[PDB]
Amino acid sequence: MNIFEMLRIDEGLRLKIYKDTEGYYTIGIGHLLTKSPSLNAAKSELDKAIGRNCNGVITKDEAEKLFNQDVDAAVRGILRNAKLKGVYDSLDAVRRCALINMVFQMGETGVAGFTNSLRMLQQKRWDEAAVNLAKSRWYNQTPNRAKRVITTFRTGTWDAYKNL
C-alpha cells in the first residue's frame, strides 16, 4: 500500500462535480474546487484547473493528474512548515502517510492546529496521541475515515486499509 492507494480509498473517484461531506464543490479524487455556493463559480474553477471547457465533467486521466498535483503539494506543504516538518522527519514510513492524508484532507493550517497531538506523535506516544486526535471536530464529522488514519498512527501498519 502507498499514499496514493490510501487516499484513493478514503476519497473515492468522481468524474462529475460533486459536493463533499462539508457541502463543497469537489471533483476527482477529493480535489476541492471552491467553498463558494455557486455551481457556476465551481465550473469556472474547474475549467481553470484543467485548461479546457469541461462543462463539469473530466476524464480519469485528468482526475489522476489533479491527484498527482495535490499529493505533491501536500508533501511540499509539510516540508515547508516548521511545526509539520519536524514531526514528519521524526516518523517512520507508514506514519508519514497518515500525516500526509490529514494534510490532504484538512490543509496545512488545519493540521498544524493539532498542537498537542503533534507533540505526542513526535514523542512516539502512540496510544496517547490516538486518544487525543479523536477529540476533534474532524473525528466527529468523518469518523470512519478518521479511525482509519488514527489506527495507522497508532499501529504503524496498514491494517485499517487491508480490509478495504
Side-chain angles (χ1 to χ4, degrees):
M1 174 113 333
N2 63 55
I3 193 54
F4 292 91
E5 292 174 359
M6 191 200 203
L7 286 159
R8 166 81 180 67
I9 283 161
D10 284 336
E11 296 287 353
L13 167 60
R14 296 201 227 158
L15 305 182
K16 183 98 238 279
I17 293 179
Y18 73 91
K19 288 190 200 196
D20 78 5
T21 65
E22 298 281 1
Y24 309 136
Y25 286 127
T26 309
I27 196 145
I29 304 143
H31 181 82
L32 175 71
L33 293 165
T34 179
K35 295 196 190 174
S36 140
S38 168
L39 168 69
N40 277 316
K43 276 144 124 130
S44 177
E45 284 297 317
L46 177 64
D47 288 344
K48 175 172 66 93
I50 299 302
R52 89 193 170 54
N53 251 60
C54 290
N55 179 37
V57 174
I58 67 172
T59 69
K60 202 174 162 149
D61 277 66
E62 288 168 347
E64 271 159 8
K65 172 163 245 189
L66 293 174
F67 188 34
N68 281 148
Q69 298 166 176
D70 298 344
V71 176
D72 190 63
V75 175
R76 279 181 300 78
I78 287 164
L79 303 168
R80 280 191 276 99
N81 187 301
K83 278 114 203 238
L84 301 179
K85 182 170 198 321
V87 181
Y88 191 89
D89 290 341
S90 69
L91 290 171
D92 58 279
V94 179
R95 299 184 166 90
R96 280 173 183 179
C97 287
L99 189 69
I100 298 175
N101 192 309
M102 293 184 71
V103 175
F104 184 99
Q105 196 182 350
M106 87 190 74
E108 208 197 289
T109 304
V111 178
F114 289 49
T115 301
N116 309 319
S117 305
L118 296 183
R119 212 190 62 254
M120 296 168 216
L121 293 163
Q122 226 197 297
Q123 299 166 51
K124 317 200 174 271
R125 291 177 181 228
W126 320 126
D127 287 51
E128 305 86 316
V131 159
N132 190 263
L133 277 163
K135 297 178 168 141
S136 53
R137 178 194 195 265
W138 171 65
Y139 183 82
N140 284 100
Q141 285 329 107
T142 46
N144 292 149
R145 171 180 194 158
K147 275 169 208 162
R148 287 197 285 277
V149 176
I150 288 169
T151 294
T152 307
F153 276 132
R154 210 185 10 105
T155 69
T157 74
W158 292 108
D159 293 351
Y161 287 84
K162 288 163 177 178
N163 268 32
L164 278 24

